[PDB]
Design an enzyme around this catalytic site. Structure first.
Site, PDB file in Angstrom:
ATOM      1  N   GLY C  10       0.781  -0.954   0.232  1.00 44.40           N
ATOM      2  CA  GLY C  10       0.180  -0.475  -0.094  1.00 44.40           C
ATOM      3  C   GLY C  10       0.969   1.285   0.351  1.00 44.40           C
ATOM      4  O   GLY C  10       1.948   1.028   0.055  1.00 44.40           O
ATOM      5  N   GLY C 134      -7.167   0.821   3.225  1.00 43.50           N
ATOM      6  CA  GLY C 134      -6.603   1.657   1.556  1.00 43.50           C
ATOM      7  C   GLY C 134      -7.662   0.522   0.700  1.00 43.50           C
ATOM      8  O   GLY C 134      -7.742  -0.574   1.586  1.00 43.50           O
ATOM      9  N   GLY C 135      -7.565   0.380  -0.462  1.00 46.08           N
ATOM     10  CA  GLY C 135      -7.307  -1.014  -1.936  1.00 46.08           C
ATOM     11  C   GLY C 135      -6.914  -1.904  -1.339  1.00 46.08           C
ATOM     12  O   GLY C 135      -7.025  -3.055  -2.345  1.00 46.08           O
ATOM     13  N   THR C 170      -9.701   9.461   6.974  1.00 42.57           N
ATOM     14  CA  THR C 170     -10.024  10.080   5.177  1.00 42.57           C
ATOM     15  C   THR C 170     -10.661   9.829   4.614  1.00 42.57           C
ATOM     16  O   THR C 170     -10.894  10.437   3.592  1.00 42.57           O
ATOM     17  CB  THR C 170      -7.734   9.618   5.186  1.00 42.57           C
ATOM     18  OG1 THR C 170      -7.877   7.835   5.556  1.00 42.57           O
ATOM     19  CG2 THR C 170      -7.007   9.844   6.061  1.00 42.57           C
ATOM     20  N   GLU C 245       9.973 -16.025  20.184  1.00 42.26           N
ATOM     21  CA  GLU C 245      10.198 -16.213  21.831  1.00 42.26           C
ATOM     22  C   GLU C 245       8.914 -15.233  22.397  1.00 42.26           C
ATOM     23  O   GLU C 245       8.276 -15.844  22.833  1.00 42.26           O
ATOM     24  CB  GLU C 245      11.127 -15.541  22.368  1.00 42.26           C
ATOM     25  CG  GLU C 245      11.544 -15.604  23.515  1.00 42.26           C
ATOM     26  CD  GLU C 245      13.035 -16.115  23.923  1.00 42.26           C
ATOM     27  OE1 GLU C 245      14.193 -15.457  23.325  1.00 42.26           O
ATOM     28  OE2 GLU C 245      13.124 -17.190  24.841  1.00 42.26           O
TER      29      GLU C 245
HETATM   30  N1  LIG Z   1       0.233   7.317   9.860  1.00 44.54           N
HETATM   31  C1  LIG Z   1       0.814   6.967   8.479  1.00 44.54           C
HETATM   32  N2  LIG Z   1      -0.499   6.344   8.014  1.00 44.54           N
HETATM   33  C2  LIG Z   1      -0.578   6.755   6.759  1.00 44.54           C
HETATM   34  C3  LIG Z   1       0.833   6.507   5.623  1.00 44.54           C
HETATM   35  N3  LIG Z   1       0.244   6.561   4.805  1.00 44.54           N
HETATM   36  C4  LIG Z   1      -0.628   6.506   4.169  1.00 44.54           C
HETATM   37  N4  LIG Z   1      -1.411   6.119   6.095  1.00 44.54           N
HETATM   38  C5  LIG Z   1      -2.812   5.742   5.667  1.00 44.54           C
HETATM   39  O1  LIG Z   1      -3.298   5.062   4.752  1.00 44.54           O
HETATM   40  C6  LIG Z   1      -4.808   5.713   4.879  1.00 44.54           C
HETATM   41  C7  LIG Z   1      -5.000   6.047   3.022  1.00 44.54           C
HETATM   42  O2  LIG Z   1      -4.820   5.229   2.515  1.00 44.54           O
HETATM   43  P1  LIG Z   1      -4.197   4.191   1.286  1.00 44.54           P
HETATM   44  O3  LIG Z   1      -3.199   3.345   1.843  1.00 44.54           O
HETATM   45  O4  LIG Z   1      -2.766   5.461   0.934  1.00 44.54           O
HETATM   46  O5  LIG Z   1      -4.345   3.643   0.066  1.00 44.54           O
HETATM   47  P2  LIG Z   1      -4.164   2.264   0.214  1.00 44.54           P
HETATM   48  O6  LIG Z   1      -3.733   1.446   0.803  1.00 44.54           O
HETATM   49  O7  LIG Z   1      -2.599   2.937  -1.340  1.00 44.54           O
HETATM   50  O8  LIG Z   1      -5.384   1.397  -1.511  1.00 44.54           O
HETATM   51  P3  LIG Z   1      -5.583   2.382  -2.452  1.00 44.54           P
HETATM   52  O9  LIG Z   1      -5.384   4.032  -2.548  1.00 44.54           O
HETATM   53  O10 LIG Z   1      -7.076   2.180  -3.242  1.00 44.54           O
HETATM   54  O11 LIG Z   1      -4.602   1.938  -3.597  1.00 44.54           O
HETATM   55  C8  LIG Z   1      -4.385   7.037   5.475  1.00 44.54           C
HETATM   56  O12 LIG Z   1      -6.058   7.061   6.295  1.00 44.54           O
HETATM   57  C9  LIG Z   1      -3.901   6.780   6.659  1.00 44.54           C
HETATM   58  O13 LIG Z   1      -4.442   6.530   7.798  1.00 44.54           O
HETATM   59  C10 LIG Z   1       1.987   7.516   7.070  1.00 44.54           C
HETATM   60  O14 LIG Z   1       3.184   7.494   6.330  1.00 44.54           O
HETATM   61  N5  LIG Z   1       1.948   7.618   8.032  1.00 44.54           N
END
Ligand SMILES: Nc1nc2c(ncn2[C@@H]2O[C@H](COP(=O)(O)OP(=O)(O)OP(=O)(O)O)[C@@H](O)[C@H]2O)c(=O)[nH]1
Ligand SMILES: Nc1nc2c(ncn2[C@@H]2O[C@H](COP(=O)(O)OP(=O)(O)O)[C@@H](O)[C@H]2O)c(=O)[nH]1
Ligand SMILES: Nc1nc2c(ncn2[C@@H]2O[C@H](COP(=O)(O)OP(=O)(O)O)[C@@H](O)[C@H]2O)c(=O)[nH]1
Ligand SMILES: [Mg+2]
Lengths: 29, 49, 430, 89, 426, 429
Positions: C10, C134-135, C170, C245
Site C-alpha cells: 500500500g 486502503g484498497g 480520510t 520467543e
Molecule cells: N500514520 C501514517 N498513515 C499513513 C501513511 N501513509 C498512508 N497512511 C494511511 O493510509 C490511509 C490512506 O489510504 P492508502 O493507504 O493510501 O490506500 P492504499 O492502501 O494505497 O489503497 P489504494 O489507495 O486504493 O491503492 C490513510 O488513512 C492513512 O491512515 C503514513 O505515512 N503514516
C-alpha cells in the site's frame, strides 16, 4: 507533558554529592 | 510658486513673521549654540551609576 | 544468520518503510550509496563488491509513490526489481485489489519471495506493514497473506497495521474495507500490532510540542517501535528475545493475537536535559493511558499479557524494583489466570537519533507490547458505523460489480461479531 | 442606476482599480506651478515630497482573475520540493 | 501511464477548452509554440497524461474539438494558445443546430460522429493505460447538448469499463439566454443519468456572483468566468500527475462520492479566492481555506447548500502543509454543522493531499460535493418544461426532424423520478 | 538531605527569587550553563537542598515560577540566570489580575492552581526528606497576595507537618505604590496567621534608608533592593548546607522563636553592610558586628525598636571566630538593654555560628527579631482599612466577582485580635 512521566522515587545524583546511603555505597568501593 | 517665494522673502522682515509662523515656534538657532543639531542632542542631566 | 523479510503493501507501507529503512541505514552506519565507510546481516546481504542491499519488498498498485523512491536519495540502495509497481490503484475498494487488479501483479511479488528466501540460510519469519483503510493495503494484503500461508507453513507472520482512527478519517468507505480484511487477519496471521493516527497526533502535540506535524513526523515514531522490537536479534544484550520467543509470552489463544503498542520516553531535545530519565520513570510513562498509540483506555479493559523490551544502560535490579511498584497499583488490573504477566528483554545499545529528527538523544528506552481486552471497545465503534451504512445498502454496487458476491458482507460481519463475543468470555474471572 | 466615471474621481469602487497593476505602473507627475493653492494640512505634515520613480513588473502565471503575483516577495515563485525531497534530502 | 482524453463540444465547450488547455500549458511550462520552458524536473515525469510526444521535443494535447458551426473554430485557433492544437483534431460541418436538440442528435449530428469516433479511436489506442474520458459542453445549446450527449452514449458502448466525467453548463434561473433552453436541458439530463459517473454542474449566475462579491471586479467578461472553471478542472486531477502525501485519481473520487448509481451530480467549488486588495493582508492558512470552501458564497452552482443535506463531500488539497490541521478542521465543520449532513453515513468528507501548489501560490484546494440541494436545479427546469409543453409550443422544430413526442414524455418522467430520489434520502 | 521547595509568586516575588537563585548559585559555584565551577570541595557536599541532578552532570533549581501574566516570566527567562531553570515548571496564564484579590483567589487563580500543585507534588514527593517550603511574594497586590496565600493554604492543608517560610514585601507609610493596598494587605493576613510558620516582613522605605545612609548609594535600584532581600534570605538557611560549630536548622529557629502559635512575623537583617568610602576606615571585629546588629537604621522594617519590647532575638554568624566573645557580647547587649527585653523570658537571644563566610567577606551575620513593636504596621494598616471601609470605596470591584462584604469585617477582626495579643503580652508581668 514532561510531568506526564511519574514523579518517581529516589534520584541518583553523583559520587561527590553525599545523600542517604552514601556511606553504604562508599563502603563497597 | 517662485513669485510667492519672492513675496515671502520680502515679507519675512516683519515682527509678526519673526515671532509667529504657521504651526511652529520661532527660530531657535540664535538661542542655541552654533553647529548643534537640535533633534539629535539630549537635554537634561544623565544619571550615572 | 537470523534474519527477517519485511513486506510493505500500500501507500502506508511505502511511506512507513521510507522512514524505517533510513534508521536501519543509520543504526548499522550504512551510507545511502549502499556501502559502509554480523549484526547487519539480518537485513543487509553482502555483495562481493562491498554493497549492502535490503531484503525487503515494496508493493503498490500505483507507481506514484514508488517512483519517488526510484528518483530519491536512496535510488542506489534498493534493488531495481525489489520495488514492484502496478499501473492502476485499487481506489478505496476491497474488491479491486483482491479479485481484479490484485491478481496480475501477485505472480511477480510471489516470485521475489521465493527468490529472497533462497539467499536466507535461516529465515525467522515475515513482517507486514500496510493499512486497513486502503484498497491495496487491505485488498492486496488479504490474498497475499492467504498465499504466504500455503507456501510457508509454520513461519511467523507479524503485522504492523494502521488501524482507522476513532474520530478523524480520510476515506468514506473505510468501515467496509476494515470489515472484510479481518477475515484474513484471524487465521492467516499470528500477532497483529495495530496503531492509528489520532493517538500519535496527540503524542506530538503534548510531548514534543510540535503544533503542526505531518506523516514524516508520525512515520519516525512508528519507525522507532519496530527497531526496538527487532533490537534483540541484532545487538548483544543481557537477555535477548526472538520473534518466536515473544509470541509465546503474548498470545494465549489462537484467536486472541491483538496487542497494543507503546513507546516511552518521547520528549524533545530541549526538554530532555533538564529532566532525569530513570528506569522507573520510562517504565511508568508506558502504563499511562495518554501514551497509548491506539485510542483505547486500559482502565475499561483488563491486561492479559505484557512484554517489556529495554535498550541502553539498564541494570536488572532497577527493572525488578520498578515492576514491583507497578504490581501494587490498584488502577492496573490483571486477569486471574495470568499470575505472571511480564516478559523482560534487555539490550545494550542506546537508541540513535536521526539528523533533523524530533526525538532527543537518550541513554535508555522501553517499548511495551501489551495485550489487553480494551480493543473490543475499539471494534464496537467500527461495527456501529458498518451496519449504520449497510442497512441502507450504500456503496454496495462498487463491490459486487467488480467480482465478489454480496454474501461476503454478511459473513464478514458475522465472522468478527463472534470475535468480540470471545473477548468478554476471556475477561470473565475464573 | 449608477453613473460610472474615471478612476481618478473617487466615485464607486475606485480602490480596487487603484490597486490594479495598470494604476500602479502609471507615473505620478511632479508638483507644479500654481500648486500652493492645493496644499493641505495632511500633505504638509504626514506625507513625503520625494519624487517617485515608476516601476515595471515582470509577467508571471495568473490562476484566478484577481491574482497579482507581481507584487510579491521572491518566495514561492518556483515549484516546491515534495515531502520526500524535503525530508530525506 | 494514466491518460485523460478531453472532449469538447459546442461553442461553450470550445471556449472553455481554450482556457483549460491554457492553464495546464501554463502549469507544465509549455509555451504557445509547443516546446518546454520550465525550471523543475518534476513537471515532465508525468506529462504524458495530457500531452503526446513528438519530434523535436514538441508536446501536443490529446484533445478533440467538435462543433457543427466553424464560427468558433476560427476563434479558438486565432487565440493565444491556438497553435499547439493538432490540425487533424477539428471535426466540423456547416448547418449548426441553432439551439435545437433534434438537429444535433438525429439528423445533422448523425453523420458527424463517424469522423469523431475515428479520431477518438485513433487517440485511444495511442495510450498505454487509458485512465478515462473528460468532456465539457453546454446543456442549453444545440451542438454541445445535441451531439455531445450522442457521443456520451456512443463512447460508453465502446469502452464500458472506464470513467465518464462531464463539466456541463446548466441553465441559470434569471439570465434566460435562450428561449428554448428548458427543452434542451430536459432532454440531455434524461440521457445523462445512465451514461455518466461524475457530473460537475457549472452555472453562469453563480460565477457572476463570485467576481462581484468575492473578487471585487467591475468587468467580469467571459475570459474571467472561464478561468475559475479552468482552475477547477486543474485541481481535480492534481494528484494524478504530481506526488503528494495521500493521492487520489478520478476513480478514487467517484468511489467515495457516489453511494448509489443515480446519485452522481456534484457541486463544485475552488478555495483560495481573494480580491486585489486582500492579497498582501491575508495569511494563506488551513483554517482560512476551510472557512472559504464550505461557505455558500464561493460556489459555482446556483443552489444553496443550506436548504439541503450534504450526502458526501470531497476535499482535494495542494502544497506543503500539515496533515493534523487538515484532519482537525474538517472534523470540526462536521461536528458543528451536524444538521447539514445526513446521519446514516459517517465521515462524509474525503481527504486528498498533493505536494505541488501552483506557481506563485502557497496553498490551494478544490471542493467537490454531492448534495440533495441540486434537486432545486432540476425542479426549476421541470416546472419550466411542463409550462411550455401543455400548450405544445415550439414543438414543430422538434417533431419536424424525425422526433416523436414520446422522448418529451419520457424525459419529464425520468427527471421527475430523480428528484423523487434525492427527496427520499434527505 | 533536607530539602526546601521554593515558589515565586507575583512580580516582586519573582524578581527577588531570581536574584536569590543568582546569589546562591554564585555561593555554590554553579555557572548559568548548569555545570560546576568552584575551588572548594564543600560546595557540592550539600547541593541536594536547592538543586536536582540532571542527565549529564548538570544541576537544576528546585523552584516553581507562577504568575498570571507572561511578562515577568519572559523577563526572568531572558535574564542572566534564566537558562538554568526547567521549562516545564514555567506555569503561567494569560489574563492579568489587575491587583484584584478576588481575581487572584477566586476566578482566574482558581484554574491555574490545579496545574501548580501538580508540579509542586512532582518536585516534593520525590524528595528524600522534605524539610519545608519557601515562598517569595508581596502583600499589597492581587497576584502576590491572593493566589500566594491560596497556595499556602492548600500546601499547608495537604502537608500538615512541615515548615513554611514566606518572605513578603509589606506596605510602607510614605512609599505607597498601590491604591487598594490596605484592602489587599488586610485580605491576606487572615490566611497568613492561620497557615504559615514563619513570615518574614520586608519594607521598601527601610531598604531605601539603608541604601542612602549606611551604604550611601546614589542610585538604589530595584536590583540593589532585591539583592539585599536575597542576601538576608540565604543567611537563615546557610546552616542547612554548610558545616559549623553550633548548627541550627529551620525547625530549630521555629522552636526557639515561636512562643505562641500566632506570633511568627519576623523582622530580618544583614550585618556587615558598609560603604566603600569608609570600608578602609572601619575595622572588622565581633564587637563591631554585634553593635552593627542592633542599630535601628539597620532594621529592614518600618518599625522602631524603641517603641516596644523584644520577644526573641536570633543571630547566625558566618566565618571563623571564637565563641566566648560572641556569648559575652550577646549577654552584654541584653544586660545594657534591660528595660527593653521582656522580663518573663530570660535568655532572649539565640546565637549560631557557621564555618563558611559569604564570598568576598571575612565574616558576616544575619539578625532576626521577633518583637512586640511590629504592632505599629498592623495598626496603621487597620486604620487605613477602617478609613476606606467607612465609605466603602473601591469595593464594587470585589463585590461584583464573588467576594462578600463580611469577609472584610472578619479580616479586620483578626487584625484587631492580633494587635490585642501583641499589646497584652507586651504589658504582662
Ligand atoms: N500514520 C501514517 N498513515 C499513513 C501513511 N501513509 C498512508 N497512511 C494511511 O493510509 C490511509 C490512506 O489510504 P492508502 O493507504 O493510501 O490506500 P492504499 O492502501 O494505497 O489503497 P489504494 O489507495 O486504493 O491503492 C490513510 O488513512 C492513512 O491512515 C503514513 O505515512 N503514516
Ligand atoms: N461560463 C461561460 N458560459 C458560456 C461561454 N460561452 C457560452 N456560454 C453559455 O452557453 C450558452 C450558449 O451555448 P451555445 O453556443 O448555444 O451551445 P452550442 O449550441 O452547443 O454551440 C449561453 O447561455 C452562454 O451563457 C463561456 O465562455 N463561459
Ligand atoms: N523590592 C522590590 N519591590 C518591588 C519590586 N517590584 C514591585 N515591588 C513592590 O511591590 C508593590 C506592588 O505589588 P504588585 O507588584 O502590584 O503585586 P502583584 O500585582 O501581585 O505582582 C510595590 O509597593 C513595590 O514596593 C522590585 O523589583 N523590588
Ligand atoms: Mg493506493
Amino acid at each position: 507533558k514532561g510531568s506526564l512521566t511519574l514523579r518517581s522515587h529516589h534520584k541518583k545524583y553523583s559520587k561527590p554529592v553525599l545523600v542517604y546511603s552514601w556511606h553504604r555505597d562508599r563502603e563497597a568501593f | 510658486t517662485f513669485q510667492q517665494k519672492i513675496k515671502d522673502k520680502k515679507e519675512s522682515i516683519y515682527l509678526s513673521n519673526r515671532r509667529a509662523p504657521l504651526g511652529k515656534s520661532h527660530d531657535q538657532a540664535p538661542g542655541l549654540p552654533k553647529g548643534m543639531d537640535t533633534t539629535n542632542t539630549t537635554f537634561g542631566t544623565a544619571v550615572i551609576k | 544468520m537470523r534474519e527477517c523479510i519485511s513486506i510493505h503493501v500500500g501507500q502506508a507501507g511505502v511511506q512507513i518503510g521510507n522512514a524505517c529503512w533510513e534508521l536501519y541505514c543509520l543504526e548499522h552506519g550504512i551510507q545511502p550509496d549502499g556501502q559502509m565507510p554480523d549484526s547487519f546481516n539480518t537485513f543487509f546481504s553482502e555483495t562481493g563488491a562491498g554493497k549492502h542491499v535490503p531484503r525487503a519488498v515494496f508493493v503498490d498498485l500505483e507507481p506514484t509513490v514508488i517512483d519517488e523512491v526510484r528518483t530519491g536519495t536512496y535510488r542506489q540502495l534498493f534493488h531495481p526489481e525489489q520495488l514492484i509497481t502496478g499501473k492502476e490503484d485499487a481506489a478505496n475498494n476491497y474488491a479491486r485489489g483482491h479479485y481484479t487488479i490484485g491478481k496480475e501483479i501477485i505472480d511477480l511479488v510471489l516470485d521475489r519471495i521465493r527468490k529472497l528466501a533462497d539467499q536466507c540460510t535461516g529465515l525467522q519469519g515475515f513482517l507486514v506493514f500496510h493499512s486497513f483503510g486502503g484498497g491495496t493495503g487491505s485488498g492486496f494484503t488479504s490474498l497475499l497473506m492467504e498465499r504466504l500461508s500455503v507456501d510457508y507453513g509454520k513461519k511467523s507472520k507479524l503485522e504492523f497495521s494502521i488501524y482507522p482512527a476513532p474520530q478523524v478519517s480520510t476515506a468514506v468507505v473505510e468501515p467496509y474495507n476494515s470489515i472484510l480484511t479481518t477475515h484474513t487477519t484471524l487465521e492467516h496471521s499470528d500477532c497483529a500490532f495495530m496503531v492509528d493516527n489520532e493517538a500519535i497526533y496527540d503524542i506530538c502535540r503534548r510531548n514534543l510540542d510540535i503544533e503542526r506535524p505531518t506523516y514524516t513526523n508520525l512515520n519516525r515514531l512508528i519507525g522507532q517501535i519496530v527497531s526496538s522490537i527487532t533490537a534483540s536479534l541484532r545487538f548483544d544484550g543481557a537477555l535477548n528475545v526472538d520473534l518466536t520467543e515473544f509470541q509465546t509470552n503474548l498470545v494465549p489463544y489462537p484467536r486472541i493475537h491483538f496487542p497494543l503498542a507503546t513507546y516511552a520516553p518521547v520528549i524533545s531535545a530541549e526538554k530532555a536535559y533538564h529532566e532525569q530519565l530513570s528506569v522507573a520513570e520510562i517504565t511508568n510513562a508506558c502504563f499511562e493511558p495518554a501514551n497509548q498509540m491506539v485510542k483505547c483506555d486500559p482502565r475499561h479493559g483488563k491486561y492479559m499479557a505484557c512484554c517489556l523490551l529495554y535498550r541502553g544502560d539498564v541494570v536488572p535490579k532497577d527493572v525488578n524494583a520498578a515492576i514491583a511498584t507497578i504490581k501494587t497499583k490498584r488502577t492496573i488490573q490483571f486477569v486471574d489466570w495470568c499470575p505472571t504477566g511480564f516478559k523482560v528483554g534487555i539490550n545494550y545499545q542506546p537508541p540513535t537519533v536521526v539528523p533533523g529528527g524530533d526525538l532527543a538523544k537518550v541513554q535508555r528506552a522501553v517499548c511495551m507490547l501489551s495485550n489487553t481486552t480494551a480493543i473490543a471497545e475499539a471494534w464496537a465503534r467500527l461495527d456501529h458505523k458498518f451496519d449504520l451504512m449497510y442497512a441502507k445498502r450504500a456503496f454496495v454496487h462498487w463491490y459486487v460489480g467488480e467480482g465478489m458476491e454480496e454474501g461476503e458482507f454478511s459473513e464478514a460481519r458475522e465472522d468478527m461479531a463472534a470475535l468480540e463475543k470471545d473477548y468478554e468470555e476471556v475477561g470473565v474471572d475464573s | 442606476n449608477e453613473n460610472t466615471y474615471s478612476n481618478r474621481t473617487l466615485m464607486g469602487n475606485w480602490n480596487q482599480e487603484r490597486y490594479d497593476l495598470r494604476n500602479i505602473v502609471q507615473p505620478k507627475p511632479l508638483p507644479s506651478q500654481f500648486g500652493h493653492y492645493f496644499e493641505t494640512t495632511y500633505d504638509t505634515s504626514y506625507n513625503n515630497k520625494m519624487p517617485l520613480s515608476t516601476h515595471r513588473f515582470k509577467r508571471e502565471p495568473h490562476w484566478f482573475p484577481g491574482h497579482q503575483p507581481e507584487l510579491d516577495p521572491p518566495r514561492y515563485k518556483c515549484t516546491e520540493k515534495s515531502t520526500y525531497m524535503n525530508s530525506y534530502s | 501511464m494514466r491518460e485523460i482524453v478531453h472532449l469538447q463540444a459546442g461553442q461553450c465547450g470550445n471556449q472553455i477548452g481554450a482556457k483549460f488547455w491554457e492553464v495546464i500549458s501554463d502549469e507544465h511550462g509549455i509555451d504557445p509554440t509547443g516546446t518546454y520552458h520550465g525550471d523543475s524536473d518534476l513537471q515532465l515525469e508525468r506529462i504524458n497524461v495530457y500531452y503526446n510526444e513528438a519530434t523535436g521535443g514538441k508536446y501536443v494535447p490529446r484533445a478533440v474539438l467538435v462543433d457543427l458551426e466553424p464560427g468558433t473554430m476560427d476563434s479558438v485557433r486565432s487565440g493565444p494558445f491556438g497553435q499547439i492544437f493538432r490540425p487533424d483534431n477539428f471535426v466540423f460541418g456547416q448547418s449548426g443546430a441553432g439551439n435545437n436538440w433534434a438537429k444535433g442528435h438525429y439528423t445533422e449530428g448523425a453523420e458527424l460522429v463517424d469522423s469523431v469516433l475515428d479520431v477518438v479511436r485513433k487517440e485511444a489506442e495511442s495510450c498505454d493505460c487509458l485512465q478515462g474520458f473528460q468532456l465539457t459542453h453546454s446543456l442549453g445549446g444545440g451542438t454541445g447538448s445535441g451531439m455531445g450527449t450522442l457521443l456520451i452514449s456512443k463512447i460508453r458502448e465502446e469502452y464500458p469499463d472506464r470513467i465518464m466525467n462531464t463539466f456541463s453548463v446548466v441553465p441559470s434561473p434569471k439570465v434566460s439566454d435562450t428561449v428554448v433552453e428548458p427543452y434542451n436541458a430536459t432532454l440531455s439530463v434524461h440521457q445523462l443519468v445512465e451514461n455518466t459517473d461524475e457530473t460537475y454542474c457549472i452555472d453562469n449566475e453563480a460565477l457572476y456572483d463570485i467576481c462581484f462579491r468575492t473578487l471585487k471586479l467591475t468587468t467580469p467578461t467571459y475570459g474571467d468566468l472561464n478561468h475559475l472553471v479552468s482552475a477547477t478542472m486543474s485541481g481535480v486531477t492534481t494528484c494524478l500527475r504530481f506526488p503528494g502525501q495521500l493521492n487520489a485519481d478520478l476513480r478514487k473520487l467517484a468511489v467515495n462520492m457516489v453511494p448509489f448509481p443515480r446519485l452522481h451530480f456534484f457541486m463544485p467549488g475552488f478555495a483560495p479566492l481573494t480580491s486585489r486588495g486582500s492579497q498582501q493582508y491575508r495569511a494563506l492558512t488551513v483554517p482560512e481555506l476551510t472557512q472559504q470552501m464550505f461557505d455558500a458564497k464561493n460556489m459555482m452552482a446556483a443552489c444553496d447548500p443550506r436548504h439541503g443535506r450534504y450526502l458526501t463531500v470531497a476535499a482535494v488539497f495542494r502544497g506543503r502543509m500539515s496533515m493534523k490541521e487538515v484532519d482537525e478542521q474538517m472534523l470540526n465543520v462536521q461536528n458543528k454543522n451536524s444538521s447539514y449532513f445526513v446521519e446514516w453515513i459517517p465521515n462524509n468528507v474525503k481527504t486528498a493531499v498533493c505536494d505541488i501548489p501552483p506557481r506563485g501560490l502557497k496553498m490551494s484546494a478544490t471542493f467537490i460535493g454531492n448534495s440533495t440541494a441540486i434537486q432545486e436545479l432540476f425542479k426549476r427546469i421541470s416546472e419550466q418544461f411542463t409550462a411550455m409543453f401543455r400548450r405544445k409550443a415550439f414543438l414543430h422544430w422538434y417533431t419536424g426532424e424525425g422526433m416523436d413526442e414520446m422522448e418529451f414524455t419520457e424525459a419529464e418522467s425520468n427527471m421527475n423520478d430523480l428528484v423523487s430520489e434525492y427527496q427520499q434520502y434527505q
